């Protein structure tokens, strides 16, 4: 349940960002556009530098983001701000991959992000009410 829903949400946001075009998932998408576009514009210079260092240009470089995610969580801190930030950076990456015509890599990118989130944080997500907790955390 949670993996499928998380992948639907994350990949839809990533595809919409790269190409510029139930109720819980709709409001989660609505949240990602508001907060996630905000993070991207607020941190554009830092995100550019990060993408440069990581050098993500094809689908074997996609695993870089999952390594970044494990590193980010390795201090033992979990919160919705970090999760939305990681998805926002993923969207920043998918935007670049489409420009170099690596649309091949958009969904595998969304899958790697979802993989790390659900597998290493499954019970935290469930305890927090999943994507309903995400929406409420970032609500109005």
């Amino acid at each position: 349940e949670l993996y499928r829903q998380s992948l639907e949400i994350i990949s839809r946001y990533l595809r919409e960002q790269a190409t510029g075009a139930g109720a819980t998932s709709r409001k989660a998408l609505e949240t990602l556009r508001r907060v996630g576009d905000g993070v991207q514009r607020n941190h554009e210079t830092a995100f550019q530098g990060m993408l440069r260092k990581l050098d993500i240009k094809n689908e074997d470089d996609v695993k870089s983001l999952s390594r970044v995610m494990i590193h980010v969580f390795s201090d033992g801190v979990t919160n919705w701000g970090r999760i939305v930030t990681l998805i926002s950076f993923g969207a920043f990456v998918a935007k670049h991959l489409k420009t170099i015509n690596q649309e091949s890599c958009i969904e595998p990118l969304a899958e790697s992000i979802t993989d790390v989130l659900v597998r290493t944080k499954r019970d935290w997500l469930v305890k927090q009410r999943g994507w309903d907790g995400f929406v409420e955390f970032f609500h109005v």
């Binding site: 830092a46 980010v72 390795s74 701000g81």
Partner: peptide, 13 residues
Amino acid sequence: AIAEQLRRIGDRF
């Protein structure tokens, strides 16, 4: 340092 920045951004919320 990439991790430290993403952590800082996220922990700001």
